[PDB]
């Protein structure tokens, strides 16, 4: 039982036990399935559902050559950085959206899924980088970051920090320090006359 008319299982994949750290954000190609974006948009499940370059009311009657689903986990404070032309630690060193971004940003609180009473220190974020990330770039290197003045010689220590730090996701956190799951849809439209699409 499998057909290209099967609806894309967004419900199942979104509900996964674990997501990727924002610094190594995971990217899927939605292919050979029917994506009904009204089922997401009209499910009151998601806190953030903001689209850019496209009206979300008319996602279902558009033609897409290529659809990308970028997924990761950040804190609720940082969800406002998942937008074009934003600044901060995430947008600059983890996940940058371009100014001409044509897609949708979907986010929802995942406290019950990603927070652990022991403390969940496995979701990471990048804290230092020589330059800001170009849009849709992904940096997973672990080179020892040089503060600015004195050399590091590839060894950690004073003014020489490991570029990745762990989030501290416990369920007693404030809403702003609680983990939020983010899914970012990237659209490629079909060059075609109005008469067809």
């Amino acid at each position: 039982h499998h057909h290209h008319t099967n609806l894309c299982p967004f419900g199942e994949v979104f509900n996964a036990t674990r997501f990727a750290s924002v610094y190594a954000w995971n990217r899927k190609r939605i292919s050979n399935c029917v994506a009904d974006y009204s089922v997401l948009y009209n499910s009151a499940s998601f806190s953030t559902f903001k689209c850019y370059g496209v009206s979300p009311t008319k996602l279902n009657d558009l033609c897409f050559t290529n659809v990308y689903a970028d997924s990761f986990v950040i804190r609720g404070d940082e969800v406002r950085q998942i937008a074009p032309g934003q600044t901060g630690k995430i947008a600059d060193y983890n996940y940058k959206l371009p100014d001409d971004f044509t897609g949708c940003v979907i986010a929802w609180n995942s406290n019950n899924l990603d927070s652990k009473v022991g403390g969940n220190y496995n979701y990471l974020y990048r804290l230092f980088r020589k330059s800001n990330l170009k849009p849709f770039e992904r940096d997973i290197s672990t080179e020892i970051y040089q503060a600015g003045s004195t050399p590091c010689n590839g060894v950690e220590g004073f003014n020489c920090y490991f570029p990745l730090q762990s989030y501290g996701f416990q369920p007693t956190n404030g809403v702003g320090y609680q983990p939020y799951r983010v899914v970012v849809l990237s659209f490629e439209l079909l060059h075609a006359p109005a008469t067809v699409c």
Partner: antibody, heavy 128, light 115 residues
Framework: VQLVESGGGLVQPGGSLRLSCAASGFTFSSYSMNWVRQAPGKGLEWVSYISSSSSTIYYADSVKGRFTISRDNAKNSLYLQMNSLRAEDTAVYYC??????????????????????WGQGTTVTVSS | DIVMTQSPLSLPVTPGEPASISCRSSQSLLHSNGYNYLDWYLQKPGQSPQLLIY???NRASGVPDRFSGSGSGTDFTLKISRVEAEDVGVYYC???????????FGQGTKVDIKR
């Protein structure tokens, strides 16, 4: 399912094969890995452990000097080389990921929260 | 080198009524930070093991209200307030105090539908 075992099958005693556990959907490099097997009828038995940075490795007494566990974070996969197989090694072999991270040189899981992700298991039958 | 002792071996349950499994350890599992390093797993028939309780008494993700872990030091217990049909399987407890050197499980507890 976010972990998928492969490579299991039929093998004659004294022989060898390698198992592979392929992660997808999360950052494989951030978690440690475990191999856990279940002999036919019997219960669960832990086999080996590899840290996130692949720097701290522990086996069990039953498989020492025979099994060697390894990981390749670039390929989001976990490996288990099973040499000098015996008939009692027949079992369904699971890969699972315990939560937590290792600090300094001493291997100890900080902020532990169990093996929240288990594979589907691959079956290994050792018989001549 | 810590010995887990589950009881009972088999446990019939009526859907809609409570149930209790016990796990006893040969040594205390209470660490000096105040956490009990003991997990509970469930292996539904023909299915992979599933995490139920971590750190002694805390439910894993997705686990319904019905399940709850308790106990401290050396005697721990699982408790299903309302057993339901799908809970049939084998329940293992696991000490985590000596991770990652040794990961010791219990014998398991097979669960039947009582009739």
């Amino acid at each position: 399912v976010q972990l998928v075992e492969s490579g299991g099958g039929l093998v004659q005693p004294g022989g060898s094969l390698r198992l592979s556990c392929a992660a997808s959907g999360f950052t494989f490099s951030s978690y440690s890995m475990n191999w856990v097997r279940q002999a036919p009828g019997k219960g669960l038995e832990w086999v080996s452990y590899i840290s996130s940075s692949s720097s701290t490795i522990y086996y069990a007494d039953s498989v020492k000097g025979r099994f060697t566990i390894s990981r390749d974070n670039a390929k989001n996969s976990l490996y288990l080389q099973m040499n000098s197989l015996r008939a009692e090694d027949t079992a369904v072999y699971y890969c699972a990921s315990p939560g937590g991270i290792t600090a300094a040189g001493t291997s100890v899981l900080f902020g532990y929260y169990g093996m929240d992700v288990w594979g589907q298991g691959t079956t290994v039958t050792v018989s001549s | 080198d810590i010995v887990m002792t589950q009881s009972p071996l088999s446990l019939p349950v009526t859907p809609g009524e409570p149930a209790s499994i016990s796990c006893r350890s040969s040594q205390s599992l209470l660490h000096s930070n105040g956490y009990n390093y003991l997990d509970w797993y469930l292996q539904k028939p023909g299915q992979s093991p599933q995490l139920l309780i971590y750190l002694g008494s805390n439910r894993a993700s997705g686990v319904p209200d019905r399940f709850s872990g308790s106990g401290s030091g050396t005697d721990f217990t699982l408790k299903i307030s309302r057993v339901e049909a799908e809970d049939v399987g084998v329940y293992y407890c696991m000490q985590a105090l000596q991770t990652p050197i040794t990961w010791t499980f219990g014998q398991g507890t097979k669960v039947d539908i009582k009739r």
